[PDB]
Amino acid sequence: LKTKEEHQKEVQYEILQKTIPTFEPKESILKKLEDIKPEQVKKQTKLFRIFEPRQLPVYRANGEKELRNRWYWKLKRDTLPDGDYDVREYFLNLYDQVLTEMPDYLLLKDMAVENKNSRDAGKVVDSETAAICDAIFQDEETEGVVRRFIAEMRQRVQADRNVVNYPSILHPIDHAFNEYFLQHQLVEPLNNDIIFNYIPERIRNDVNYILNMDRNLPSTARYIRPNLLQDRLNLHDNFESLWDTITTSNYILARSVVPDLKELVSTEAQIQKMSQDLQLEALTIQSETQFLTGINSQAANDCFKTLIAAMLSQRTMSLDFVTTNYMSLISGMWLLTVVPNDMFIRESLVACQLAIINTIIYPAFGMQRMHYRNGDPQTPFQIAEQQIQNFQVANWLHFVNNNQFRQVVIDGVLNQVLNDNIRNGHVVNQLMEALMQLSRQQFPTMPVDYKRSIQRGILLLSNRLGQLVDLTRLLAYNYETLMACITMNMQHVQTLTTEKLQLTSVTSLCMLIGNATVIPSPQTLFHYYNVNVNFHSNYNERINDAVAIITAANRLNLYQKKMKSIVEDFLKRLQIFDISRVPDDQMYRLRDRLRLLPVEIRRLDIFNLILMNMEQIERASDKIAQGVIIAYRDMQLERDEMYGYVNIARNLDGFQQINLEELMRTGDYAQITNMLLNNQPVALVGALPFITDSSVISLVAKLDATVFAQIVKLRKVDTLKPILYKINSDSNDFYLVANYDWVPTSTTKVYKQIPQQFDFRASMHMLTSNLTFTVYSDLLAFVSADTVEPINAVAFDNMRIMNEL
Amino acid sequence: RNLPSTARYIRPNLLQDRLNLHDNFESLWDTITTSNYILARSVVPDLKE
Numbered sequence: 001l002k003t004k005e006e007h008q009k010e011v012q013y014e015i016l017q018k019t020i021p022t023f024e025p026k027e028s029i030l031k032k033l034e035d036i037k038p039e040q041v042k043k044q045t046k047l048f049r050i051f052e053p054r055q056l057p058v059y060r061a062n063g064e065k066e067l068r069n070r071w072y073w074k075l076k077r078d079t080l081p082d083g084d085y086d087v088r089e090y091f092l093n094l095y096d097q098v099l100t101e102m103p104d105y106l107l108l109k110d111m112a113v114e115n116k117n118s119r120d121a122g123k124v125v126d127s128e129t130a131a132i133c134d135a136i137f138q139d140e141e142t143e144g145v146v147r148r149f150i151a152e153m154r155q156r157v158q159a160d161r162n163v164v165n166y167p168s169i170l171h172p173i174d175h176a177f178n179e180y181f182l183q184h185q186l187v188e189p190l191n192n193d194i195i196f197n198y199i200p201e202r203i204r205n206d207v208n209y210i211l212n213m214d215r216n217l218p219s220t221a222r223y224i225r226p227n228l229l230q231d232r233l234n235l236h237d238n239f240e241s242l243w244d245t246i247t248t249s250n251y252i253l254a255r256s257v258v259p260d261l262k263e264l265v266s267t268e269a270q271i272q273k274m275s276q277d278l279q280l281e282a283l284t285i286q287s288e289t290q291f292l293t294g295i296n297s298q299a300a301n302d303c304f305k306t307l308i309a310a311m312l313s314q315r316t317m318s319l320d321f322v323t324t325n326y327m328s329l330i331s332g333m334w335l336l337t338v339v340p341n342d343m344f345i346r347e348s349l350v351a352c353q354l355a356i357i358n359t360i361i362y363p364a365f366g367m368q369r370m371h372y373r374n375g376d377p378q379t380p381f382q383i384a385e386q387q388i389q390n391f392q393v394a395n396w397l398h399f400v401n402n403n404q405f406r407q408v409v410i411d412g413v414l415n416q417v418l419n420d421n422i423r424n425g426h427v428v429n430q431l432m433e434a435l436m437q438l439s440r441q442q443f444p445t446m447p448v449d450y451k452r453s454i455q456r457g458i459l460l461l462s463n464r465l466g467q468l469v470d471l472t473r474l475l476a477y478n479y480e481t482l483m484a485c486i487t488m489n490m491q492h493v494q495t496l497t498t499e500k501l502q503l504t505s506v507t508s509l510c511m512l513i514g515n516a517t518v519i520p521s522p523q524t525l526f527h528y529y530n531v532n533v534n535f536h537s538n539y540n541e542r543i544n545d546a547v548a549i550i551t552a553a554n555r556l557n558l559y560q561k562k563m564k565s566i567v568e569d570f571l572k573r574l575q576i577f578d579i580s581r582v583p584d585d586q587m588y589r590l591r592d593r594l595r596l597l598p599v600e601i602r603r604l605d606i607f608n609l610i611l612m613n614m615e616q617i618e619r620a621s622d623k624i625a626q627g628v629i630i631a632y633r634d635m636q637l638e639r640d641e642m643y644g645y646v647n648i649a650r651n652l653d654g655f656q657q658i659n660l661e662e663l664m665r666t667g668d669y670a671q672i673t674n675m676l677l678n679n680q681p682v683a684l685v686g687a688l689p690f691i692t693d694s695s696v697i698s699l700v701a702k703l704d705a706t707v708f709a710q711i712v713k714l715r716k717v718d719t720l721k722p723i724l725y726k727i728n729s730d731s732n733d734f735y736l737v738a739n740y741d742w743v744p745t746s747t748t749k750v751y752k753q754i755p756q757q758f759d760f761r762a763s764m765h766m767l768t769s770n771l772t773f774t775v776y777s778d779l780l781a782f783v784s785a786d787t788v789e790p791i792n793a794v795a796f797d798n799m800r801i802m803n804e805l
Numbered sequence: 806r807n808l809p810s811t812a813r814y815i816r817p818n819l820l821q822d823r824l825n826l827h828d829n830f831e832s833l834w835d836t837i838t839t840s841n842y843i844l845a846r847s848v849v850p851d852l853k854e
């Protein structure tokens with residue numbers, strides 16, 4: 001009967017557990033939270049370039065090779081795919097590269113080489129810029145001014161004003177990419193008071209922790225502000241299972257920084273006194289050796305670490321007890337009056353408060369038992385606060401009904417604070433006024449051996465007033481000072497899975513506390529604050545990095561792109577969740593909330609820098625013709641300076657345009673075959689890889705028109721290679737153009753834009769930046785903190801905590 | 806534990822016996838109530854003390 005039902009639980013608890021993303025070892029979450037870095041301070045050592053000036057041969061009309069050669073602006077690493085859709089998903093991968101290769105601070109002194117052909121000692125900005133200015137100097141074709149000017153391009157160092165500017169040679173696309181990296185830094189100046197303003201306000205205005213700043217920081221020191229703002233994804237309301245990890249992780253992180261107790265009562269002396277007063281051998285009770293199972297000096301530390309960390313992370317807390325063992329239930333009166341009663345999951349809060357009333361409080365005053373239906377908006381203390389007639393007890397039941405977390409907002413965060421009657425411990429003086437008169441009013445039908453075994457069990461806690469008022473001064477001071485090191489909001493919703501607290505472990509805390517006061521030492525109070533900013537700065541640097549891909553996929557009109565892969569990338573970088581157990585419901589709100597957010601300011605202007613230059617990168621490439629124009633008549637080849645004789649079109653004017661990437665997705669080839677079997681002029685825009693024939697005997701034979709007929713045989717449009725005629729002197733058979741009296745005619749030309757020439761005056765521009773920095777990533781390493789002696793430690797009131805000695 | 810808004814359960818159809826097996830079925834009602842007598846015998850708790 002036992003192993004059937006202890007296994008029937010672990011099936012139903014495992015269909016629930018396979019929708020929570022918590023890791024299967026519970027304490028393994030703590031290793032993943034310390035292990036995140038602040039960020040990576042990226043500094044580029046080469047100026048960002050996508051264009052390079054290349055040498056190209058130049059033809060005249062009646063095309064021969066001119067002896068002059070002219071520069072052009074052909075781009076390098078042109079890995080541009082074919083098709084109008086794969087040319088757009090290339091620019092998303094370009095945009096993903098530049099967000100990763102984005103320098104946070106640009107120092108410009110280390111990227112500077114000597115101008116080897118200057119008269120004065122002048123510098124430039126790159127090893128590639130000096131290669132260009134070496135090449136414009138030696139060229140015979142260049143103007144006499146540019147041979148004179150690039151000898152006199154002097155840089156201006158100004159060490160006293162900390163500014164420096166160097167000459168440069170950049171493309172106009174490359175210049176806007178390299179003024180945005182250089183004007184919009186992420187470093188901000190750092191003074192000696194912005195370290196003092198970093199520390200939380202409750203700690204530097206506390207008199208225990210003595211914070212003193214020792215190291216001297218110069219004027220040239222900068223730092224990186226953590227992107228530190230509250231969760232613009234409301235992860236608390238609609239996410240039932242994604243929130244149950246972000247309070248599980250903040251629980252085990254806050255479980256390691258709440259300190260452990262020292263100098264307790266000896267557990268062999270307190271048990272022998274407690275076993276004398278209960279008089280357990282004389283009773284006829286089914287639980288004799290089971291009252292005192294959970295009293296140790298280890299369960300006292302386990303109850304202290306739980307009750308603070310389940311309070312700092314707003315994690316619910318189911319109770320576990322046994323209603324026979326009233327000594328785990330009298331001590332449960334202290335738990336409800338100190339821990340705010342909205343913390344517990346409600347059906348156990350009721351089942352602990354009904355079990356106190358129905359066995360201890362209502363048999364005391366002799367009134368009838370408590371028939372309680374569960375679907376009732378009144379808690380069982382809220383019913384007996386109006387029906388009980390004693391005033392010392394009813395004025396205690398007015399406090400357990402009304403201790404909840406009163407939400408206050410300070411220093412930009414929302415933290416759930418306690419009330420000032422419980423934070424100085426005066427509430428326990430009201431409970432012992434209720435617990436004294438509950439140990440005097442005789443239990444009018446209880447057996448006499450069971451009446452004194454439960455009145456002396458009360459006086460094991462009623463007589464322990466001074467050790468227990470001094471406990472809640474400590475339990476609400478460790479919670480009060482650890483809450484200064486909280487950066488995220490403290491939102492209180494009912495979590496799915498509850499961290500079980502045993503009431504046999506609360507009764508090992510109330511009567512095994514000693515008057516040695518613990519306090520979070522400032523080495524583990526700056527560690528809990530640096531591990532809670534670095535998680536909150538990482539959580540914001542991913543919801544800004546995911547939105548700049550969710551939006552940039554939609555501005556680029558990339559269909560065939562699954563946003564579930566980006567949100568699985570987003571929940572994987574955040575080191576708590578795992579992408580398996582999270583349900584498919586709560587990942588379709590997560591891809592829906594992320595579409596509505598605004599993109600971050602420094603990721604938007606560099607995407608608008610690509611979107612307005614999305615054409616001019618893919619236009620000036622080789623290996624891509626961006627449309628073919630078929631006319632089915634004899635029109636001449638337009639003579640060109642760069643290609644010689646060429647069939648090229650400058651604009652699709654007066655022709656019906658068939659969008660080829662639309663023609664690929666739909667498969668609706670009813671028009672294009674009806675435009676080819678009949679001889680009608682069609683233009684086919686897209687992104688078509690051309691081939692380049694040089695012979696003129698391939699032009700008279702007219703192999704330019706024999707390529708478009710493959711669409712009707714096999715319906716795919718990928719294998720389209722419109723040819724591009726290049727009739728030059730260096731091509732073969734060029735006697736057939738020069739000697740004979742004919743004009744070269746091509747039926748179908750192709751659409752292509754020629755690359756722009758190298759103009760020095762529109763390519764030289766100074767780059768003005770700073771000279772030296774010293775980026776400090778750590779900021780609590782400048783304060784030198786030493787705590788006060790622990791025995792002189794004070795609460796919010798300037799009287800000391802643990803005032804029993 | 807409290808359960809989310811996306812949990813479900815299959816409700817069993819618990820409606821009283823539409824055959825009236827206690828009526829005129831004097832052989833089938835005997836072994837349908839020995840089945841219920843032996844089950845209730847191994848449930849009712851034994852005395853102590």
